[PDB]
Amino acid sequence: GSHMKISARNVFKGTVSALKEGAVNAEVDILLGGGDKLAAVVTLESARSLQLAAGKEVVAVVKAPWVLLMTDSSGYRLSARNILTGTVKTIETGAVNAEVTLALQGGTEITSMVTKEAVAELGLKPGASASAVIKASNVILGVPA
Amino acid sequence: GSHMKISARNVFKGTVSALKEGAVNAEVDILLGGGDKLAAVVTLESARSLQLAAGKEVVAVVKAPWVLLMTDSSGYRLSARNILTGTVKTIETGAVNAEVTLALQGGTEITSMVTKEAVAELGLKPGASASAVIKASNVILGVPA
Amino acid sequence: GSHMKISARNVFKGTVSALKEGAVNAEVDILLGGGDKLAAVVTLESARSLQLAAGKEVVAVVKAPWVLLMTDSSGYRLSARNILTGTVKTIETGAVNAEVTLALQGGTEITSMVTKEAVAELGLKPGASASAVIKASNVILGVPA
Ligand code: MOO
Ligand code: MOO
Ligand code: MOO
Numbered sequence: 001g002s003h004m005k006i007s008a009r010n011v012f013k014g015t016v017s018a019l020k021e022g023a024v025n026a027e028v029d030i031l032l033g034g035g036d037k038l039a040a041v042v043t044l045e046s047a048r049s050l051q052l053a054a055g056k057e058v059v060a061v062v063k064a065p066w067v068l069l070m071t072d073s074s075g076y077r078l079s080a081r082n083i084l085t086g087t088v089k090t091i092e093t094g095a096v097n098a099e100v101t102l103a104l105q106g107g108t109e110i111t112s113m114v115t116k117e118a119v120a121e122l123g124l125k126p127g128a129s130a131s132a133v134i135k136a137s138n139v140i141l142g143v144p145a
Numbered sequence: 146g147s148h149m150k151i152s153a154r155n156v157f158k159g160t161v162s163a164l165k166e167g168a169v170n171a172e173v174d175i176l177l178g179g180g181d182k183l184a185a186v187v188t189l190e191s192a193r194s195l196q197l198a199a200g201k202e203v204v205a206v207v208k209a210p211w212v213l214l215m216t217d218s219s220g221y222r223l224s225a226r227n228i229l230t231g232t233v234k235t236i237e238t239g240a241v242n243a244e245v246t247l248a249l250q251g252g253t254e255i256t257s258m259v260t261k262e263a264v265a266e267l268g269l270k271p272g273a274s275a276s277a278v279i280k281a282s283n284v285i286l287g288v289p290a
Numbered sequence: 291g292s293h294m295k296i297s298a299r300n301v302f303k304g305t306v307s308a309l310k311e312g313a314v315n316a317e318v319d320i321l322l323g324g325g326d327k328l329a330a331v332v333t334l335e336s337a338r339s340l341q342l343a344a345g346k347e348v349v350a351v352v353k354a355p356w357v358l359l360m361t362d363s364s365g366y367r368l369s370a371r372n373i374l375t376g377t378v379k380t381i382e383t384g385a386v387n388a389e390v391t392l393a394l395q396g397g398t399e400i401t402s403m404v405t406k407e408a409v410a411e412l413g414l415k416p417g418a419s420a421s422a423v424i425k426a427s428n429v430i431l432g433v434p435a
Contacts, residue, residue: 001362006423007408008358024169024314041188043331046369059366064405065210065355068153068285072146075290076204079191094386096239096258099405113386113405115209115244115258118152133151135285140358140425145365169314186333210355213298213430217291220435221349224336241384241403260354260389260403263297278296280430 004142009064009099009111012038016054021047028052028141030060034106039081040139050143059142067112068133069100071122082134084110088124100124102132149287154209154244154256157183161199166192173197173286175205179251184226185284195288204287212257213278214245216267227279229255233269245269247277294432299354299389299401302328306344311337318342318431320350324396329371330429340433349432357402358423359390361412372424374400378414390414392422 004011014030017037021027026047028040038060042050052058070083086102089109098116101109110132124130149156159175162182166172171192173185183205187195197203215228231247234254243261246254255277269275294301304320307327311317316337318330328350332340342348360373376392379399388406391399400422414420 001364003362004360004364004366005362005412006358006360007402007404007412009405009408022169024312040369042369050367050369061358061368063355063358065208068151068206068208070149070151072148072150074146074149076149076287077195077290078206079185079187079195079286092386094240095384096237096242096244097386099386112152114152115154118154122150122152133285137282137427140423141369142366145367167314210353213296213351213353215294215296217293217295219291219294221294221432222340222435223351224330224332224340224431239385241382241387241389257297259297260299263299267295267297278430282427 004059006061008061010062012060012108014058014060016052016056016058019047019052019054027136030058032108034104034108036084036104036106036108038139039136040141041136042141057144061140061142062134062138064099064111064113066134066138067110069112069114069122070131070133078133080133081136084132086110086132088126088128088130091119091124102130149204151206153206155207157205157253159203159205161197161201161203164192164197164199172281175203177253179249179253181229181249181251181253183284184281185286186281187286202289206285206287207279207283209244209256209258211279211283212255214257214259214267215276215278223278225278226281229277231255231277233271233273233275236264236269247275294349296351298351300352302350302398304348304350306342306346306348309337309342309344317426320348322398324394324398326374326394326396326398328429329426330431331426332431347434351430351432352424352428354389354401354403356424356428357400359402359404359412360421360423368423370423371426374422376400376422378416378418378420381409381414392420
């Protein structure tokens with residue numbers, strides 16, 4: 001095909017900047033288009049089978065409902081590895097849910113599915129600041145064949 | 146800020162009652178407000194960096210779509226660590242999805258996003274009994290700075 | 291009860307064809323009804339407590355929003371363990387989301403919740419080919435008591 005056609009709202013192309021393998025799992029640090037950084041955690045088995053290595057090109061795939069949005073950390077530090085700061089670009093409201101797209105510094109867009117109550121409570125609006133919070137274990141990797 | 150403002154429908158404050166670290170991951174057992182217990186699984190790296198320890202205060206964050214609802218286990222035992230029993234308090238139906246809030250014994254409320262077909266099939270209604278089923282690996286932790 | 295009543299759209303009965311335990315986690319390979327294969331990853335603790343073994347009957351539970359749909363891999367290989375190919379049987383559109391059901395070869399049906407934009411972009415329609423992509427870590431297991 002011309003590309004990979006997958007339902008996930010967020011499919012990023014990038015280059016591995018680091019590969020950190022343990023005996024069970026491996027942490028893959030990816031440098032995205034705009035300069036944004038995204039970490040993924042995959043099994044050791046996958047790191048070997050996909051032939052991962054620093055410097056190789058990969059795709060990182062994150063479904064919309066897996067992305068949490070945060071506006072005020074209030075000093076808290078979280079266990080999720082990926083905290084990407086950006087500005088709200090688009091909100092489309094559904095019945096219970098809504099789709100929010102943030103623009104990150106560098107130009108990458110990330111899409112989150114949250115409740116319409118969350119949009120309301122967070123005060124989201126075009127231009128508002130917010131961070132996308134993604135567990136590295138919720139990032140699926142792809143490698144070209 | 147006055148608090149942490151995050152999209153997740155479920156943000157619980159609690160105290161760590163146990164910390165169980167292995168070489169890869171760590172199990173964090175949290176005692177919530179009402180007496181409810183919730184287990185989270187985080188990387189070893191996070192357990193060290195966040196300075197986790199039994200007796201310390203934490204926040205546990207669970208997105209709505211990550212909570213499954215069960216009414217009849219029919220004798221089955223599941224691999225998910227958190228099975229919290231409660232009574233239905235609120236259901237708001239959307240187009241395909243719905244938001245269900247359960248009250249747990251002690252007073253904590255938990256919110257789940259499920260399909261409207263699931264609500265129908267389960268026979269959910271105010272006062273019905275049901276359990277929230279949450280994998281401990283789907284619980285994100287926060288620690289005050 | 292007559293069965294297990296749980297919200298997840300996908301609850302499959304099967305027999306364990308392989309059990310692969312490591313020091314942290316265990317991979318459980320399940321042979322489903324129609325001949326379809328599904329892999330689950332659970333803690334070692336659960337594999338021991340549930341008394342898992344090859345040849346035993348289990349239930350595998352996957353929430354709808356945890357299933358990604360793919361139509362053209364374009365040569366890419368992914369880190370998710372489960373790539374199940376099938377044909378679209380039913381789509382019900384909501385406001386922002388939609389529910390897609392695929393029929394797999396053998397007769398098993400799998401349901402995915404994706405955005406209505408994904409349905410549009412993928413060109414989904416009754417009879418179209420598509421694969422369900424599920425991380426083995428997003429499969430919850432149940433064992434009869
Ligand atoms: O696969 Mo989706 O359309 O990001 O939920
Ligand atoms: O971040 Mo949510 O999906 O409003 O619980
Ligand atoms: O628990 Mo679900 O989101 O109705 O598959």
